[PDB]
Design a protein around this nucleic acid. Structure first.
Ligand SMILES: OC[C@H]1O[C@H](O[C@H]2[C@H](O)[C@@H](O)[C@@H](O[C@H]3[C@H](O)[C@@H](O)[C@@H](O[C@H]4[C@H](O)[C@@H](O)[C@@H](O)O[C@@H]4CO)O[C@@H]3CO)O[C@@H]2CO)[C@H](O)[C@@H](O)[C@@H]1O
Lengths: 97, 365
RNA sequence: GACCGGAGUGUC
RNA sequence: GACGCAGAGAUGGUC
């Protein structure tokens, strides 16, 4: 169901995709919620969880590899992490997180 | 491409590992068996972060709570497999009509006693106070068992009518809780009575109670099949019989069903099925686990037929039948933690029986 | 090599 | 249009 919630945030509000881009968003505290794919390597989900921890940002764990994330965010390529900035008509930061 | 299994510390975890070796020698898949403390408490917290295991083992009760949180994989065994295991054992592992784990065994507490200190075991709880004074002359206790987990004192509190949740037309009424009823009080009182009348210390736990029976220091204990192997090795002449009746009624142990659910988030769910279905749930697997620590009444018909003659399993089957099957709903957790504190506080002194149970009556919902 | 940069882009 | 790289940062830039 959340796959629709993600898509929604993408038409009205801003988001960002990829590792590099989200860590930056965590440093800036501009992202509210982050989303990391299931079978993401360890160093990396540790390093994300770590900035999310320092940034005091929430984390949602997607029940499906980056492959389905890209599909869920309107892309063709794989995306192991999604930084949600502001959500328009969507409620993922106020319902599930 | 591996399978990480979490099984409880008082089970055949070395023997489950032994089943993992065959799985390695026949595909090269790493079967890692661990037995972490408070695993049933950990699995929900660690699967919400995606760091949990692939296969988790526990009695059917903690599985409904997981299923309601989507932490368990919808298991998909074929029609032929389902008819290999008892139709009742699958019911224990069913949440919202969907099968969430594989049944492995039916567990039930029984009266374990020392034939050398007691040829004819008590038929009722009401005679234990006397039998204790009699053994205090020979410098030995009569009954020693773990009073820290409510599961062991429940056969007594349930005996005279105590219950968890009222069962009605299939659904469990989460608002009707039988921990405060007149019957429940009586049984919990009786426990607190032997405690107050110096027949059973209120600080005794699993480690203590097991130690006393196994070192010949007490006539009887209340335990499950798992504790047999360690008793067998103490070289104590022992038997496994029906639980004593309290108030002319049978004790109603909460029957568990050692299930093995799959982590919904696990990447190796496909490998879990091959392992659990064609390497564990077979006369070969259960045997290797049962040789480490007995399962007793087994979910798999094949191996069960073999073990049936054992008079120890006869008792288990007896008690399992005389008692009630544990509900699998998510609210079980609350009722347990709630009754946990009642039996302790009641026996310690903090709260009186009526007070302890009156509080569990509320904390349970 | 380090940094910048954020969706494409190299081949036949 | 298939392959190859490419948000787990591609090609591309600048020192
Ligand atoms: O309060 C702190 C304590 O918390 C923990 O104890 C809890 C369990 O986590 C709950 O799950 C529950 O316990 C039930 C258990 O769920 C149920 O399956 C049954 O378990 C038996 C089971 O038949 C069998 O597999 C065998 O291994 O033993 C189990 C009993 O030990 O009954 C349990 C009730 O005791 O509630 C308890 C607390 O009441 C934690 O594990 C404790 O260490 C901690 O102190």
């Amino acid at each position: 169901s959340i796959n629709q919630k993600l898509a929604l945030v993408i038409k009205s509000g801003k988001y960002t995709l990829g590792y590099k881009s989200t860590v930056k968003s965590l440093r800036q505290g501009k992202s509210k919620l982050i989303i990391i794919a299931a079978n993401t390597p360890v160093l990396r989900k540790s390093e994300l969880e770590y900035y999310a921890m320092l940034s005091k940002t929430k984390v949602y764990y997607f029940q499906g590899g980056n492959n389905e994330l890209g599909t869920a965010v309107g892309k063709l390529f794989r995306v192991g992490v999604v930084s949600i900035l502001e959500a328009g008509d969507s409620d993922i930061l106020t319902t599930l997180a | 491409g591996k399978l990480v299994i979490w099984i409880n510390g008082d089970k055949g975890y070395n023997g489950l590992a032994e089943v993992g070796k065959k799985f390695e020698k026949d595909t090269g898949i790493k079967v890692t068996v661990e037995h972490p403390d408070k695993l049933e408490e950990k699995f929900p917290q660690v699967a919400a972060t995606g760091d949990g295991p692939d296969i988790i083992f526990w009695a059917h009760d903690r599985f409904g709570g997981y299923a309601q949180s989507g932490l368990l994989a919808e298991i998909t065994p074929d029609k032929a497999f389902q008819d290999k295991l008892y139709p009742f054992t699958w019911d224990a592992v069913r949440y919202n009509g969907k099968l969430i784990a594989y049944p492995i065994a039916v567990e039930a507490l029984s009266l374990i006693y020392n034939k050398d200190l007691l040829p004819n075991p008590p038929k009722t709880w009401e005679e234990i106070p006397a039998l204790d004074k009699e053994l205090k002359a020979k410098g030995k206790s009569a009954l020693m068992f773990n009073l820290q987990e409510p599961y062991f004192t429940w056969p007594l509190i349930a005996a005279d009518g105590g219950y968890a949740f009222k069962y009605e037309n299939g659904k469990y009424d989460i608002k009707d809780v039988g921990v405060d009823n007149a019957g429940a009080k009586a049984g919990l009182t009786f426990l607190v009575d032997l405690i107050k009348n110096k027949h059973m210390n209120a600080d005794t736990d699993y480690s203590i109670a097991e130690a006393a029976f196994n070192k010949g220091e007490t006539a009887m204990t209340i335990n499950g099949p798992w504790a047999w192997s360690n008793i067998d090795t103490s070289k104590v002449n022992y038997g496994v019989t029906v639980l004593p009746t309290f108030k002319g009624q049978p004790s109603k142990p909460f029957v568990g069903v050692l299930s093995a659910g799959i982590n919904a988030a696990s990447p190796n769910k496909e490998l879990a099925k091959e392992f659990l279905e064609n390497y564990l749930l077979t006369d070969e697997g259960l045997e290797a686990v049962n040789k480490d620590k007995p399962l007793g009444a087994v979910a798999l018909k094949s191996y069960e037929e073999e073990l049936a003659k054992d008079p120890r399993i006869a008792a288990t089957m007896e008690n399992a039948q005389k008692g009630e099957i544990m509900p699998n709903i998510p609210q079980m957790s609350a009722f347990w933690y709630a009754v946990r504190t009642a039996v302790i506080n009641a026996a310690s002194g903090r709260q009186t029986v009526d007070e302890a149970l009156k509080d569990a009556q509320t904390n349970s919902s």
